[PDB]
Amino acid sequence: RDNIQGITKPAIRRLARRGGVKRISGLIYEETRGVLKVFLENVIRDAVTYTEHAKRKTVTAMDVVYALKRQGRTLYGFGG
């Protein structure tokens, strides 16, 4: 449990650098965790809800693609 804080700080630092940032502050990681919590919440609710409407308890790859397309995040290379 408590894997929201379990996200490694250097991983968020690498993502921020890949966002083209030269100096990385120590409070960036926690803000990233807080934002990513809700960002994952929205997409997980969408995809699992698509799965639930089809009377399924196991989410496949296609429902993720459908939910992302509805939200405006169509993903290539994984089908869709």
């Binding site: 449990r1 894997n3 929201i4 379990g6 996200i7 490694t8 991983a11 968020i12 690498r14 993502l15 921020a16 650098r17 890949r18 966002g19 083209g20 940032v21 030269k22 100096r23 990385i24 502050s25 409070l27 960036i28 926690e30 803000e31 990233t32 934002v35 990513l36 809700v38 960002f39 994952l40 919440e41 929205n42 997409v43 997980i44 609710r45 995809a47 699992v48 308890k57 196991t58 989410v59 496949t60 790859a61 429902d63 993720v64 693609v65 992302l68 995040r73 993903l75 994984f78």
Partner: protein, 97 residues
Amino acid sequence: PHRYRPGTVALREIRRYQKSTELLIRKLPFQRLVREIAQDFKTDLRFQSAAIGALQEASEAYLVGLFEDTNLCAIHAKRVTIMPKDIQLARRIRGER
């Protein structure tokens, strides 16, 4: 073995992140995070490896675009370092809370 001033290998490291295409985030930690997050919704669920990979890749792309937004806000603010309030301003403009 000599040490360089700030900004030498960092930008190179940035290039190492931008040139490369494989998932920089290690798989199993984010996998277990997804497990815990989804387990809070309904217990005793099974999630496909293909789906969790798509979710992780989408999360990586969303994060890198979000730090692009944070960089743009910081540059507009005449700073180099990024701060949480940059993201606070950016998200409210985008409209996602």
